[PDB]
Design a protein around this nucleic acid. Structure first.
Ligand code: ATP
Ligand code: ATP
Ligand code: K
Ligand code: K
Ligand code: K
Ligand code: K
Ligand code: K
Ligand code: K
Ligand code: K
Ligand code: K
Ligand code: K
Ligand code: K
Ligand code: K
Ligand code: K
Ligand code: K
Ligand code: K
Ligand code: K
Ligand code: K
Ligand code: K
Ligand code: K
Ligand code: K
Ligand code: K
Ligand code: K
Ligand code: K
Ligand code: K
Ligand code: K
Ligand code: K
Ligand code: K
Ligand code: K
Ligand code: K
Ligand code: K
Ligand code: K
Ligand code: K
Ligand code: K
Ligand code: MG
Ligand code: MG
Ligand code: MG
Ligand code: MG
Ligand code: MG
Ligand code: MG
Ligand code: MG
Ligand code: MG
Ligand code: MG
Ligand code: MG
Ligand code: MG
Ligand code: MG
Ligand code: MG
Ligand code: MG
Ligand code: MG
Ligand code: MG
Ligand code: MG
Ligand code: MG
Ligand code: MG
Ligand code: MG
Ligand code: MG
Ligand code: MG
Ligand code: MG
Ligand code: MG
Ligand code: MG
Ligand code: MG
Ligand code: MG
Ligand code: MG
Ligand code: MG
Ligand code: MG
Ligand code: MG
Ligand code: ZN
Lengths: 534, 48
RNA sequence: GGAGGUAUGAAAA
RNA sequence: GCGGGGUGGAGCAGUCAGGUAGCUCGUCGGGCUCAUAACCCGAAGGUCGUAGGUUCAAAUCCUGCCCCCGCAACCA
RNA sequence: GAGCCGUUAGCUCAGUGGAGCAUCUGACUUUUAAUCAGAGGGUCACAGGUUCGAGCCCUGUACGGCUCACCA
RNA sequence: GUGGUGGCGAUAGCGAGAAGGAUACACCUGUUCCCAUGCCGAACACAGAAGUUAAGCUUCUUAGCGCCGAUUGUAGUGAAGGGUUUCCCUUUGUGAGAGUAGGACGUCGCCACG
RNA sequence: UGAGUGUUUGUACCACAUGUACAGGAUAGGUAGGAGCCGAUGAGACCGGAACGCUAGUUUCGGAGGAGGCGCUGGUGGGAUACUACCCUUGUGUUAUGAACCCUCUAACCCGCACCACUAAUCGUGGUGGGAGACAGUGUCAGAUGGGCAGUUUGACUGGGGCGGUCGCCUCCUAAAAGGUAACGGAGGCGCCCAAAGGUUCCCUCAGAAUGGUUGGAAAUCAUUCGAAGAGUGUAAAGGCAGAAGGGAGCUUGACUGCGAGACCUACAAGUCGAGCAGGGACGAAAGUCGGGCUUAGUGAUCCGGUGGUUCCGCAUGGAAGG
RNA sequence: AAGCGACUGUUUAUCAAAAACACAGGUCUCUGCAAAAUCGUAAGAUGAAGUAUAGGGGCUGACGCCUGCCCGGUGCUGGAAGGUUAAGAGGAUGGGUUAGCUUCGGCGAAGCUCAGAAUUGAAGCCCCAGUAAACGGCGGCCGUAACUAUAACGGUCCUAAG
RNA sequence: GGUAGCGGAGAAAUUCCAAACGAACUUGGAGAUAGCUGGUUCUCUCCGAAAUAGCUUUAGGGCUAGCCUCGGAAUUGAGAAUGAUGGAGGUAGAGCACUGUUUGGACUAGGGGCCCAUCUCGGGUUACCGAAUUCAGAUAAACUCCGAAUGCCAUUCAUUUA
RNA sequence: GAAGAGACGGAGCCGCAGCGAAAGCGAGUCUGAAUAGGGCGAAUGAGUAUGUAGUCGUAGACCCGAAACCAUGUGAUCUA
RNA sequence: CCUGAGUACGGCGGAACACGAGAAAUUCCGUCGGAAUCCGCGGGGACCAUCCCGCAAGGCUAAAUACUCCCUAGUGACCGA
RNA sequence: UACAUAGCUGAUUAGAGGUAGACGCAGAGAACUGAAACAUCUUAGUACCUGCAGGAAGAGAAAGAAAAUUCGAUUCCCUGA
């Protein structure tokens, strides 16, 4: 994999500017960058989906296994087995091959040569992707991540975010690829599932490029780290792990900063003398002469004076509730719920939040965490029981799968509210790193991370006193995650949160944790680990 | 930001016309119906 | 029991 | 004519690189003290010199203007 | 020699239709000092002119302080 | 006489006032129709003829405004000269602006209906 | 410029070992051959040791014993069983080794070290020791440093020169009613902008004032009247524009291609205008208008280089390189 | 009696004899000997037929009292991890040609040939520390005393230090 | 006797190196180059400038054009002067119709004082300052409702001329 | 061949066809889709060899004149 | 069987070819690497294929050409102190 | 140092130096100047210095010129230009 003089500019905002990179074979490269840096765009260039405006991007002829950052569900009714089966081209070729036989009967002596060649390749190609896979895939689920066979016959759209990630990851492995391009392979996975993915990637003999915002996950796998810069629009490749990249990078910006400082001092020195000559008496001929001579050096200095790159601005969040929390914000009493045709997730579930409380809904993948939160908002109507919100409680919902954005509309149109004027919307969008005409961009072209900021911005603009957040740190760059956690910690309201990120929950400072599926309203503590172990 | 651009005939890929556009006002590649002297007929010309 | 070494607050009444 | 500056009472950031007006001392009020100082707790104090442009948005960018500081205003 | 700068209460300073300090008087104190309060003290250096009207503008005279001040 | 349509520098205009709709033009009656209002059949478009000269419209009176504007005189100035020569004067030719006498409430055409 | 040692390494043979997904009898690597194969040259079963191991078994070494088993056959599975060939993963070694470093050696090279001979000799050349040593020295190449040294550059205008200002383009006044006309004369602008702020069809007329009217105030929006331009025309000024060039809407891209009679301007290079013809179009019923914008600034010769197109050339010829 | 130079000396032959140079003394620095330094392309020389109490270079200039603060910048000295970095090594890939295949099509081995990425690659530079008898540098604003004045005193900006 | 010029020597002055040393002398490259100054020799005849535009590391140089000279070609004679006619233009002058500058008068919004009464509020005042309007009167290179004399362009025009 | 004229020597040079960058076409050709327009040419013909004169180019180029630069050499009998 | 080896050639750095590295032949020098050999080798202006021409890395070779310090015999629209 | 070589002795052999201020080949090799400045470039491989020469030198018998199909060592002249 090699790229030279890479250039790419969507409209007025550019991604790559004369960027270059060379990746040797059998390198587990960790791709790192802030949201929008252009990490996903790099893969699109490798997959030839995009074309560089200028430059050459070189890819090996080997087959590539691509794990998209977003799940591709062509139709809502697609079953998990259909989704997985689409990983291999067995079905596609057979449909073509079946048609080839039909053409052979219709045509006698005209197209036989073309048909016979096409049939031969399909058979040879079909045998290369040995048709025994029908059994291998069935057992690949068992050995991979303990994916139950009941899910195997269930619509994919109905799976949980963690479950979908397992299916998509298995599909990539099912294709039997030669190069692995994983775009956030552990976005929704729980702690247990991440262990399997880590072990497989350690053992994987081939080259694997990983886009991840999980530093610990990368450090266990990565041997080479590629950093996509958002301000310089360039690519830098280091040898080592995430910390080594940070150490090397921090030193380089320090050494660059000192260079720019000394160039400024010399310019100031000349400038100070030029001014002294400029204001001297016209009768001081020699000083006036020397002043012009230094004016020439000053001009040449100012034309070779390196500009310091503008440090990328970090998100600023100030979430405050309009009204005040009550001692009983939310009352859940004897609530039972089941998805039609499936086992009851919880029976007679009853809990009561206290107000300005950090409430963690713990659990594992596919256990009902997101279902419970959907239950409170009203997306799911409880099969039994009642859910009562105090009239003083305003609720803000952050969905897990980013289902609250209109892909067709722009960023500004999505955030439009009756309670906020235009400049207020722009100011807040600037606090979320959407500057100037970046707000007129369609949501369909944004990255998952940038979309997550829009959803968060929507949550902030509500000024609710109860925050129902379902995996908020997902898709966010590591810097933005810490900002998110710190500001929530200071939030003066009730927080119902779900998070598989250990760092995020620690910053928020959880008070009570609700374990699933075994309903257990418990005080928060390192005993969270005990429930995870058990 | 205003910059000069070239409009190329989508049919024969001939760089036929020279114009300019403001990137901010027209972020997407400009397209016009212009006479293509090589093909001697009006065709869709898109910016490159 | 005994010996040596080990912050400010005026003047006069 | 050449530069440097006009942000709270004073001194200073923030200006380059447009989103949100700050730090220090000081002042007012209440505490502690026999009382003062120190110390502790509250509060106030600027629409950023001024007038127009640019912008969705100006302390910040552009233009002029008014003030204050330093230098210069002539060499054989 | 020339051109400017000024002259306002007892002192130091503001200012075309007075402030500090000082001095008195009160309070507080056994009495004071310090505080706190109140009071008085010229008005514009002197003449002339412009103006409806001059401390403010214009002249002249005094008094002082600034500057600049000749040739190869 | 009215209605179209023009030419000519408003001497054609503006203001004020008077008369008429027989025809014609208009207002005028409606939105079903093609068509339309960044709303409104006000406009545009369409269909029709209940009433009116009220208005526009045409005719007429008026010099109040605007417009046109002679002659005389003067400023200026080409040429030829002079002086006490920043300026001023003389001869010869030309000659305004301003001010005024006065003109002017239009004229020269084609077509349809009377 | 040559010897070894060791270490960490990459390559390549040669030894070995491993192959457990499901089902399947069960630890099934793939392909080819495969009815026969192996064993007194010690088979089966058995005992232990060792390795693997997914813990199920697999592989292997030894102890005894002495002749048997395995395969085809059978069902399973996508794939079938023995054994042979080609090999394929995986992990250990052997060897060839290629590198980097480690020290060590000595015979190259060096000694302004001692002694010996030429020999009168503090040169030199040989000889013997000693020291050093594949280093140094020297050759080629390369990076750095290098006023130690060398060759040079380091504007013009200008009420002398310096300092300050200016240098190209557009507009006005100077400019003396054609045009042109200078000053370090008096004033301002330009180094763009617009995807509509272009074209066309249709439609519309402003600024201010008075009066009345909630928030609302001098002044937001609304209504009548007066109001010939006192507005607007992206952007300086001049000229022009209300038969619009100002403003709104629909459709569009003529902000077209090949040109171009004839003019203006002009030392040249350039600059400016242009009816009209052809091609193929936009708008409009048609007339017709459209080769950007109310007009006049918004720009830079050649050389050199980039990108695209090209029925052009191609150093014997076909290509190619290069043009 | 004052300035300058300690002194005797030296200097612009031919407009300057001096406060200029030199000087003894001081200090810093280089130099372990085939010394450093210098002449020379080299050989060969001086340094020395000397050996750190010696030799070269910089500055200061008898003697007496002293020689303050700053190592941020520039040099020099040290450091060796990192970043940057030439030739050389290395040769993944892409063109040209064409044996041979071809469905005008086009593809295309080997050889030669035109370019060539990764990787390897010292010093230096970046960077860290020291160094001023090394090159050099050594600040502002506001208020404050019971006559007035002034500010022992207090705030505040900046700096490597004021 | 030694040190020789891309050098030597220098108690150091750009000091000396054969009577001139910021780089000795001699010979040669060599007739260096000189957009600079000076000089450039007989006669008569015909004609006869320019000291301007543009560009220029250009300004006392140069190039093209303009002005002079010599030869040639051709013309529906295209040049000059004057007259007649028709034109384009905004100067002198004049004027205030626009835009600046501006004087006085009438009136006054409004502003300033000032009282009563305040709920700054409701008034009554300076002949206090006074917008806008209007009457009268000025002014202009970058003002013009107007507008010459001249000059300029042109005429198959007319006379003279070449 | 007399240091001559002259003879021979037709290789070569200029002219007689231009147009286009070129392939190429040709009184036409180039641009162009064009039998259009336009550019350059033909219609619309004189050149060439030599002499002579004017001017220009390469040469010192009308004559004289630097401070200087560079390369061999000669100078320490003055002076350091 | 023999027909010129550290040669031809290549890299690097220079130089000569009208040709200033340019696409650059050809030739020479320094340094390092480094062939084939008759089915072979070189050139025909990068390079490859075909064709054509030639046979390097050994040597010698007169004439036509350049000049005149000299000696002889002359010549001149060459000088005349 | 044993053989020997090196040294030393003798004989033998052929060199030294000068020119003709010319012509030839080679080593090394400027600057003024031109570019209207100047560094690539030009002056120019010139001037100078040095070595080697001969009456001439140098070159010369194709690993050539070509692509008319051919020519047939080199040198010099005209032309190509
Ligand atoms: N719309 C649905 N239709 C049918 N079944 C559903 C639906 N939503 C969820 N399920 C099932 O509910 C079960 C758990 O629901 P839930 O979405 O809450 O999982 P979860 O707790 O959010 O897990 P995680 O977030 O880690 O992926 C899943 O197995 C899922 O298959
Ligand atoms: N078609 C597009 N049009 C306009 N902008 C685009 C388009 N495609 C990408 N961008 C911009 O490119 C930027 C970077 O691309 P990309 O989506 O790959 O970032 P990312 O690093 O993958 O995001 P994340 O890490 O959060 O998933 C995005 O911010 C996005 O706004
Ligand atoms: K109606
Ligand atoms: K009427
Ligand atoms: K009238
Ligand atoms: K060596
Ligand atoms: K003068
Ligand atoms: K339009
Ligand atoms: K002295
Ligand atoms: K002394
Ligand atoms: K002293
Ligand atoms: K003396
Ligand atoms: K001296
Ligand atoms: K001393
Ligand atoms: K010393
Ligand atoms: K010193
Ligand atoms: K000393
Ligand atoms: K320092
Ligand atoms: K330092
Ligand atoms: K001396
Ligand atoms: K005028
Ligand atoms: K034609
Ligand atoms: K033609
Ligand atoms: K003739
Ligand atoms: K002739
Ligand atoms: K000459
Ligand atoms: K001449
Ligand atoms: K001597
Ligand atoms: K070459
Ligand atoms: K040949
Ligand atoms: K001679
Ligand atoms: K030179
Ligand atoms: K020159
Ligand atoms: K010879
Ligand atoms: Mg992404
Ligand atoms: Mg979920
Ligand atoms: Mg008149
Ligand atoms: Mg120099
Ligand atoms: Mg020179
Ligand atoms: Mg000058
Ligand atoms: Mg001057
Ligand atoms: Mg005139
Ligand atoms: Mg004029
Ligand atoms: Mg317009
Ligand atoms: Mg060819
Ligand atoms: Mg002395
Ligand atoms: Mg003496
Ligand atoms: Mg003397
Ligand atoms: Mg003397
Ligand atoms: Mg001294
Ligand atoms: Mg001196
Ligand atoms: Mg002398
Ligand atoms: Mg010469
Ligand atoms: Mg006048
Ligand atoms: Mg001597
Ligand atoms: Mg050459
Ligand atoms: Mg070589
Ligand atoms: Mg060759
Ligand atoms: Mg060839
Ligand atoms: Mg042959
Ligand atoms: Mg010969
Ligand atoms: Mg005589
Ligand atoms: Mg004589
Ligand atoms: Mg020159
Ligand atoms: Mg001889
Ligand atoms: Zn086309």
């Amino acid at each position: 994999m090699r790229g030279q003089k890479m250039n790419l500019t969507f409209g007025l905002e550019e991604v790559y500017e004369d960027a270059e990179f060379h990746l040797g074979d059998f390198d587990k490269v960790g791709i790192v960058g802030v949201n929008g840096a252009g990490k996903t765009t790099l893969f699109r260039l490798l997959l030839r989906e995009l074309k560089l405006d200028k430059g050459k991007i070189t890819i090996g002829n080997s087959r590539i296994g691509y794990l998209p950052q977003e799940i591709i569900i062509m139709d809502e009714k697609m079953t998990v087995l259909e989704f997985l089966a689409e990983g291999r081209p067995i079905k596609k070729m057979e449909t073509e091959l079946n048609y080839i036989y039909e053409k052979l009967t219709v045509v006698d002596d005209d197209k036989q040569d073309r048909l016979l060649k096409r049939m031969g390749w399909l058979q040879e190609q079909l045998e290369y992707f040995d048709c025994y896979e029908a059994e291998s895939i069935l057992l690949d689920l068992v050995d991979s991540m303990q994916i139950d066979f009941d899910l195997f016959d269930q619509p994919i759209s109905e799976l949980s975010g963690g479950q979908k990630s397992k299916i998509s990851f298995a599909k990539v492995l099912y294709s039997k690829p030669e190069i692995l391009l994983l775009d956030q392979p552990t976005n929704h996975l729980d702690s247990s599932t991440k262990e399997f993915v880590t072990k497989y990637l350690k053992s994987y003999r081939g080259s694997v490029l990983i886009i991840s915002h999980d530093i610990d996950f990368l450090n266990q796998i990565i041997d080479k780290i590629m950093y996509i810069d958002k301000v310089t629009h360039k690519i830098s490749i280091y040898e080592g792990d995430y910390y080594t990249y940070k150490k090397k990078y921090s030193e380089n910006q320090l050494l660059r900063e000192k260079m720019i400082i000394q160039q400024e001092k010399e310019v100031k020195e000349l400038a100070t003398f030029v001014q002294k000559a400029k204001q001297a008496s016209q009768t001081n001929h020699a000083l006036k002469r020397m002043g012009l001579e230094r004016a020439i050096r000053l001009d040449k200095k100012k034309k070779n004076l390196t500009k310091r790159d503008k440090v990328y601005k970090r998100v600023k969040m100030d979430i405050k509730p309009n009204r005040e929390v009550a001692r009983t914000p939310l009352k859940v009493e004897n609530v039972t719920f089941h998805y039609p045709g499936h086992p009851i997730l919880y029976k007679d579930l009853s809990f009561q939040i206290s107000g300005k409380e950090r409430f963690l809904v713990v659990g594992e993948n596919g256990v009902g965490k997101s279902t419970l939160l959907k239950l409170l908002m009203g997306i799911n109507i409880p099969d039994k029981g009642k859910i009562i919100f105090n009239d003083k409680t305003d609720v803000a919902y952050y969905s897990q799968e980013l289902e609250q954005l209109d892909e067709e509309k722009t960023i500004l149109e999505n955030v439009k509210s009756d309670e906020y004027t235009d400049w207020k919307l722009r100011a807040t969008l600037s606090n979320f790193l959407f500057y100037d005409d970046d707000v007129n961009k369609k949501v369909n072209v944004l990255s998952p991370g940038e979309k997550a900021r829009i959803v968060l911005c929507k949550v902030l603009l509500q000024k609710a006193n109860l925050l129902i957040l379902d995996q908020p740190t997902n898709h966010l760059d590591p810097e933005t995650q810490s900002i998110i956690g710190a500001n929530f910690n200071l939030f003066e309201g009730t927080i119902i949160v779900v998070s598989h990120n250990p760092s995020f929950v620690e910053q928020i400072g959880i008070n009570r944790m609700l374990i699933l599926p075994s309903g257990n309203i418990d005080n928060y503590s390192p005993e969270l680990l005990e429930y995870y172990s058990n | 930001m205003r910059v000069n651009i070239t409009l190329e005939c989508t049919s024969c890929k001939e760089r036929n016309y020279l114009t300019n556009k403001n990137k901010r006002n027209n972020p997407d590649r400009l397209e016009k119906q212009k006479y293509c002297p090589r093909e001697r007929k009006v065709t869709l010309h898109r910016e490159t």
